[PDB]
Design an enzyme around this catalytic site. Structure first.
Site, PDB file in Angstrom:
ATOM      1  N   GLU A 149     111.683  48.870  15.642  1.00 57.07           N
ATOM      2  CA  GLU A 149     113.167  48.657  15.621  1.00 57.07           C
ATOM      3  C   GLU A 149     113.629  47.213  15.403  1.00 57.07           C
ATOM      4  O   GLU A 149     114.519  46.730  16.103  1.00 57.07           O
ATOM      5  CB  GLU A 149     113.820  49.221  16.882  1.00 57.07           C
ATOM      6  CG  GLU A 149     113.480  50.675  17.200  1.00 57.07           C
ATOM      7  CD  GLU A 149     114.534  51.361  18.063  1.00 57.07           C
ATOM      8  OE1 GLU A 149     115.389  50.663  18.624  1.00 57.07           O
ATOM      9  OE2 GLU A 149     114.533  52.611  18.168  1.00 57.07           O
ATOM     10  N   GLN A 206     115.546  45.513  13.800  1.00 58.88           N
ATOM     11  CA  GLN A 206     116.935  45.133  13.581  1.00 58.88           C
ATOM     12  C   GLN A 206     117.609  44.649  14.862  1.00 58.88           C
ATOM     13  O   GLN A 206     118.706  44.054  14.816  1.00 58.88           O
ATOM     14  CB  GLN A 206     117.750  46.280  12.974  1.00 58.88           C
ATOM     15  CG  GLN A 206     117.977  47.489  13.894  1.00 58.88           C
ATOM     16  CD  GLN A 206     116.802  48.478  13.872  1.00 58.88           C
ATOM     17  OE1 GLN A 206     115.813  48.234  13.206  1.00 58.88           O
ATOM     18  NE2 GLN A 206     116.933  49.592  14.583  1.00 58.88           N
TER      19      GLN A 206
END
Ligand code: ZN
Ligand code: ZN
Ligand code: ZN
Ligand code: ZN
Lengths: 160, 163, 160, 163
Positions: free
Chosen positions: B70, B72
């Site tokens: 993940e 981001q």
């Protein structure tokens, strides 16, 4: 149903050749294609701004843009075309000689249906290369050139 | 020699699996691997939770291969990846390329110019069943970060995205 | 419209993990999936011959086969399923420990819509690996095993 | 160190272009390249025509990187590629995977077990405009080798292939 494909890579990685391979597959199958080249470096037109070829682009099925990093207008152009129902294919350098984003090209990624980044060969040690090294001292982003002014380079070689 | 591989895609495209397949290849051949997950996403080889990758810098420094899931969600990712890669480590990053609004998600796109490889994965559209490139938020919340699954989001093509 | 995707590679390259990534994308989107594993190494069934799971396979949208090289029946099975309108995805080793074709798996290539060959990491020098080396002296094709009996290997290492 | 890359696909999928893009990357970085075409297909860096790759063995021996276009037509390809690759050369092969009948074309599939990379390219269907994986012969000739272009063949998906 339209789309946006993006072809990234350093210099000397064949981005244009890939864009054309892709575009030609549609042409030999009788789709109207247009291919747009940067003026300063099947229909094929040179341009400095994409506004100069927009009305023409409206009349075809498949659009190719070479050197998309040089076209400040690129994101809006592509998104509208694709939403018009066109296949839009863009070759563009991912980074400058400083390995920073080059123009507006990476804002195309969230909108693109496909993204790939091609490989060159290191002109300095002959491993795979992902970066472009500027050989001289100029620091402005736009310096049109070939293997005269630039080397496709790996990470080690980049930092020599 | 060190490198940055990046795996983008909409939600439901298997970015984590692809991340684990790559990391496991190095592990079965006896490398020291570390996988980093985002602490706040708990909707379910060293594995470690983090909120800022700075948290796990010293653990990262002692391994050959580092996966970031993940990615981001880590506002420090460019600096972390570039430093590790420059120290000899292989770094592999799964991350969403766009928000529910199809705009860059975090700092993640700045990793592109620094990366040796970039791929974008494909989901299947949950509304028409073509390939999906985008994620649509089903509700009306407008803040970028809302942890959730198929409950809250649909993987979606261009057509369905705008329906 | 049905299809056949093929995932080739040596051992230790994640072929199963790729097959599953692919299959799961269809499942989280509410398609009926089946995944078939070789008995000797969402519905998931072990089998020695694909005839034992054919009637079941008829009742779903997406079929996965792990270790397709072990299923003598594979080419006819896949072609019929795909022509039935199903998405068929096959992980299979491309070559034996002699780098020869493994079972009937390569006759799937001319029929497949997509073909990829994945990479392992050389267990002997740590470059990319495309081949499987058998570590002991047995010469029969089928010898079930893991990193105990086999090394994923590059070309140099293969020939040591 | 030497290697075999293989580029498969139906007709009209750009296998030759992809072959030239790869070879040109090595050439711009000052390697000696050789591209081999099949002598009898004349429907239009050392470039050379051949009928059996044995013809061009001594020319091949003096370069770093060798491309083989239309590789399905060379009954000696496995032996040639494997020997060159074993001598240090990079070998890249464009070739059709299946005949007009969708059966292996030549010896080309035996290269798969020997190859470091294998991709299969995509054409566009000349009859429905989906992606095309196969080539259909328009006429009724039944011998495997019939040199020709869109005149004689259509690139085709599964559906159109059987229409
Ligand atoms: Zn280098
Ligand atoms: Zn849709
Ligand atoms: Zn090795
Ligand atoms: Zn068709």
């Amino acid at each position: 149903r339209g789309q946006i494909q993006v072809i990234l890579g350093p210099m000397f990685s064949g981005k244009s050749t890939e864009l054309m391979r892709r575009v030609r597959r549609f042409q030999i199958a009788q789709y109207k294609c247009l291919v747009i080249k940067y003026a300063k470096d099947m229909e094929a037109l040179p341009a400095c701004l994409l506004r100069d070829v927009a009305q023409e682009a409206l009349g075809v099925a498949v659009i190719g843009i070479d050197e998309g990093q040089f076209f400040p207008d690129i994101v809006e152009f592509c998104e509208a075309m694709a939403n018009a129902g066109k296949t839009v294919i863009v070759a563009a350098l991912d980074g400058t000689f400083q390995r920073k984003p080059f123009g507006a090209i990476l804002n195309l990624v969230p909108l693109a249906e496909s993204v790939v980044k091609l490989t060159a060969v290191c002109m300095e040690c002959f491993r795979e290369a992902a970066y472009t090294k500027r050989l001289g001292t100029e620091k402005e982003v736009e310096v049109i050139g070939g293997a005269d002014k630039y080397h496709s380079v790996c990470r080690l070689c980049y930092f020599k």
